[PDB]
Amino acid sequence: NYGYQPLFEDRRPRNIGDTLTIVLQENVSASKSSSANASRDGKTSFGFDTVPRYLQGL
Amino acid sequence: ERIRDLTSVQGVRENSLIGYGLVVGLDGTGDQTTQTPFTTQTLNNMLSQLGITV
């Protein structure tokens, strides 16, 4: 004797020892990315190629 | 019977209750269920509770 068994209810595990099918379908995909940058360029110049006479002391 | 027909007692009042359900046994005069997804969704919920998983 197996006890009350339903007639229209789906066949589910109910007690200890009942078997159940597991469809293993795992798909995990995690990602991360990052970046940082900095730049700085400078040029300076001053040339008195021909100095006038009133400014040759400076 | 005048005082009862004219007044009400403090704390003696009626509240309002609301709920959602399904009506079955109609002669083809129910929802189309293609434009009312909640009818089929709640029917499937009831079946899943009762032991049928569609």
Curated annotation (Swiss-Prot), chain A:
Source superkingdom: Bacteria
Compartments in which it is found: Cell outer membrane; Bacterial flagellum basal body
Subunit structure: The basal body constitutes a major portion of the flagellar organelle and consists of four rings (L,P,S, and M) mounted on a central rod.
Function: Assembles around the rod to form the L-ring and probably protects the motor/basal body from shearing forces during rotation.
Family in the record: Belongs to the FlgH family.
Official protein name in the record: Flagellar L-ring protein
Covered residues, full protein: 59 to 116 of 232
UniProtKB/Swiss-Prot annotation, chain B:
Protein's name in the database: Flagellar P-ring protein
Subunit relationships: The basal body constitutes a major portion of the flagellar organelle and consists of four rings (L,P,S, and M) mounted on a central rod.
Location in or out of the cell: Periplasm; Bacterial flagellum basal body
This protein's encoding gene: flgI
Protein task: Assembles around the rod to form the L-ring and probably protects the motor/basal body from shearing forces during rotation.
Family: Belongs to the FlgI family.
